[PDB]
Design an enzyme around this catalytic site. Sequence first.
Site, short mmCIF file in Angstrom:
data_model
loop_
_atom_site.label_atom_id
_atom_site.label_comp_id
_atom_site.label_asym_id
_atom_site.label_seq_id
_atom_site.Cartn_x
_atom_site.Cartn_y
_atom_site.Cartn_z
N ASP A 1 2.81 2.63 7.67
CA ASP A 1 1.67 1.48 7.18
C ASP A 1 2.42 0.33 6.85
O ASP A 1 1.58 -0.24 6.21
CB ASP A 1 0.59 2.42 6.47
N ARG B 1 0.05 9.43 0.29
CA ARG B 1 -0.58 9.23 1.69
C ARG B 1 0.13 8.57 2.88
O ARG B 1 -0.04 8.63 3.89
CB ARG B 1 -2.17 9.09 1.43
N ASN B 2 0.94 7.50 2.32
CA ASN B 2 1.64 6.69 3.27
C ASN B 2 3.02 6.77 3.35
O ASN B 2 3.68 5.88 3.75
CB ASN B 2 1.27 5.28 2.76
N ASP C 1 0.70 -1.22 0.06
CA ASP C 1 0.12 0.01 -0.02
C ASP C 1 0.89 1.28 -0.08
O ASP C 1 0.68 2.28 0.93
CB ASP C 1 -0.95 -0.09 1.18
C1 LIG Z 1 -1.87 13.02 4.80
C2 LIG Z 1 -2.75 11.74 4.61
C3 LIG Z 1 -3.76 11.65 5.67
O1 LIG Z 1 -4.76 12.21 5.56
N1 LIG Z 1 -3.36 10.87 6.85
C4 LIG Z 1 -1.89 10.79 7.14
C5 LIG Z 1 -1.20 11.26 8.15
C6 LIG Z 1 -2.23 11.64 9.41
O2 LIG Z 1 -1.36 12.48 10.31
C7 LIG Z 1 -0.43 12.07 10.93
C8 LIG Z 1 -0.18 10.45 10.97
C9 LIG Z 1 1.18 10.05 11.78
C10 LIG Z 1 1.45 8.62 11.82
N2 LIG Z 1 0.64 7.76 11.62
C11 LIG Z 1 0.82 6.29 11.90
C12 LIG Z 1 0.59 5.62 10.96
C13 LIG Z 1 0.99 4.14 11.14
C14 LIG Z 1 1.19 3.84 12.63
CL1 LIG Z 1 1.45 1.79 13.11
C15 LIG Z 1 0.90 4.80 13.47
CL2 LIG Z 1 0.89 4.20 15.36
C16 LIG Z 1 0.89 5.88 13.15
F1 LIG Z 1 0.58 6.95 14.12
N3 LIG Z 1 2.38 8.29 12.66
C17 LIG Z 1 3.17 9.31 13.11
N4 LIG Z 1 3.04 10.56 12.86
C18 LIG Z 1 1.80 10.88 12.38
C19 LIG Z 1 1.86 12.37 12.08
C20 LIG Z 1 0.63 12.78 11.34
O3 LIG Z 1 0.15 14.30 11.21
C21 LIG Z 1 1.15 15.06 11.98
C22 LIG Z 1 -3.64 11.88 9.14
C23 LIG Z 1 -4.32 11.14 8.10
#
Ligand SMILES: *CCC(=O)N1CCC(Oc2cc3c(Nc4ccc(Cl)c(Cl)c4F)ncnc3cc2OC)CC1
Length: 270
Positions: free
Chosen positions: A157, A143-144, A139
């Site tokens: 992810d 966005r990831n 994936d």
């Molecule tokens: C921008 C695309 C979107 O809409 N999003 C992706 C980022 C999200 O905001 C943030 C996410 C994180 C994450 N995500 C994350 C991914 C996997 C896992 Cl296992 C875990 Cl525990 C996660 F927390 N990780 C770390 N930092 C951020 C920061 C983000 O914004 C500051 C919003 C939805």
Amino acid sequence: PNQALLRILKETEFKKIKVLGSGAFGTVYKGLWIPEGEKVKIPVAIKELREATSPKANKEILDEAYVMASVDNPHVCRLLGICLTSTVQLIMQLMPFGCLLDYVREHKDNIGSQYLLNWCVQIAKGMNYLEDRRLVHRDLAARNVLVKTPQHVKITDFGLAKLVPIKWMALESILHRIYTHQSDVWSYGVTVWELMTFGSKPYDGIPASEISSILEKGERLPQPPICTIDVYMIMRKCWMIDADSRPKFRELIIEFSKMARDPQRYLVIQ
Ligand SMILES: *CCC(=O)N1CCC(Oc2cc3c(Nc4ccc(Cl)c(Cl)c4F)ncnc3cc2OC)CC1
């Protein structure tokens, strides 16, 4: 499995501070990790997966979590800790700038060619590491990819799907549900296209069920205006029907690394 790599967190050890996003997967929060017996408050991101109706057993979840905890690469996010209750809560370092897709969209005016090429290099380094570990992401998309700082990005992810993005999938994945490192290369090509267009939606307005017929007829994402033919040819190679004819992630590192040395040659930006 190296158990020490994965922290099993107590509900008292971490606090959710603010909502960052939500979807079918669950909810992602910005929060604090406050390990007991320590004098520190660590900013983290906490992802709470939707409560499973017929969840995998705790042993199975931990087995996957150990794999996600063992990733040791500057361009792949690592699982820091897990809390298992009625839900699965995943704790990782906060990537303060958010997803790269949002980032390039918000900064279209101020993003230069070196930044763009450096991101392509870093993404390929992360994917190459995963291939070295015999791990298939499945994936990859803008966005990831998360932004730790403007010139340090990480693929996120990984393994989350285990614990459908038709417009990022190779044709064989759509038709036969086959996922390999070479299908990840196809997704990598789309991801680069997202960056070079500063966050355009691929195949904008075309329904998912029509994507495969578009690909069968030989249509591909158009060349971004800033991409020279040298860059576009690499992207197009990622979209070949023959999976083994696509570039290898190891090869993508070398090519984009070379271009990153002379960015103005390979990207023409206003
Ligand atoms: C921008 C695309 C979107 O809409 N999003 C992706 C980022 C999200 O905001 C943030 C996410 C994180 C994450 N995500 C994350 C991914 C996997 C896992 Cl296992 C875990 Cl525990 C996660 F927390 N990780 C770390 N930092 C951020 C920061 C983000 O914004 C500051 C919003 C939805």
